């Protein structure tokens, strides 16, 4: 199933970056079109965007860049693919993101001062995942050099460099039929909570594997009846084994980010 991993890893989203209209510039700022990696983070891959729009502004107006979609500030610590699936998936391509250098939304966003702040948040997500699966035995048993290769593989978009280490994180003991718990997050646009995260085992008492519907029927019973269950931009069958999804369809942070969105209007 290595072909699925590449398809998930190399997914790209066409995106249109336009400067906010109230920002005062010395000259005209043309929109910057870019293909965003679904598995990476906004603050990571936007260096070309930041330099493009910073050339047209005065240092007096320069500040910490942040992004917004339809009046909603985009959380950079969420994977790009998730933000798109959850928000702009129903609209027309390309994804329209507005660039703001001013009036930072302190309440809704985390400051991303450097690349290290992204690596810090990223490694946290991995540690939290391996704690739910192996009880942090696999991630703690890696040398610090292996932890850097996971990050370097994401930063440099190297599928083999990353999955060389990340394959050890997808393996479980023989006697067991899967992970201890499945790391996942269920996002929904109309719910007050940021997402839904609970403890769910890949195996039932009788030994049968839990499916994607079994999980939803548990932690999100109101989404099955009208709603779309979207992972990496697709709509998997509810009978998909959950253990399989965690291995193959997870993000590089080993979390399964699930979006519940209504059917597109038209």
């Amino acid at each position: 199933d290595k072909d699925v991993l590449r398809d998930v890893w190399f997914g790209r989203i066409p995106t249109c970056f336009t400067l906010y209209q109230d920002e005062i510039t010395e000259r005209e700022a043309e929109p910057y079109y870019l293909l965003l990696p679904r598995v990476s983070y906004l603050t990571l891959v936007t260096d070309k965007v930041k330099k493009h729009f910073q050339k047209v502004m005065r240092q007096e107006d320069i500040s910490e860049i942040w992004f917004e979609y339809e009046g909603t500030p985009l959380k950079w610590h969420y994977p790009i693919g998730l933000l798109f699936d959850l928000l702009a998936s129903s609209s027309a391509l390309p994804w329209n993101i507005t660039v703001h250098f001013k009036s930072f939304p302190e309440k809704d966003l985390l400051h991303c001062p450097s690349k290290d702040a992204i690596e810090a948040h990223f490694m946290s997500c991995m540690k939290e995942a391996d704690a739910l699966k192996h009880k942090s035995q696999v991630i703690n048993e890696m040398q610090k050099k292996d932890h850097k290769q996971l990050w370097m593989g994401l930063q440099n978009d190297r599928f083999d460099q990353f999955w060389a280490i990340n394959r050890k994180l997808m393996e479980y003991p023989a006697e067991e039929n899967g992970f201890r718990y499945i790391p996942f997050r269920i996002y929904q646009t109309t719910t007050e909570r940021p997402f839904i995260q609970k403890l769910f085992r890949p195996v039932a008492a009788d030994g049968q594997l839990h499916t994607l519907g079994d999980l939803l029927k548990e932690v999100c019973p109101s989404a099955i009846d009208k709603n779309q269950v979207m992972i990496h931009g697709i709509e998997p069958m509810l009978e998909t084994p959950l253990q399989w999804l965690s291995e193959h369809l997870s993000y590089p942070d080993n979390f399964l980010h699930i979006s519940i969105i209504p059917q597109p209007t038209d």
Binding site: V4, G11, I13, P14, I234, P236, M237, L249
Partner: peptide, 18 residues
């Protein structure tokens, strides 16, 4: 189904604007 849907995703999104 996942392999087909994933290739469809890339056709409609990536390959179009690449």
């Amino acid at each position: 189904h996942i392999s087909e849907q994933l290739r469809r995703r890339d056709r409609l999104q990536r390959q179009a604007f690449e």
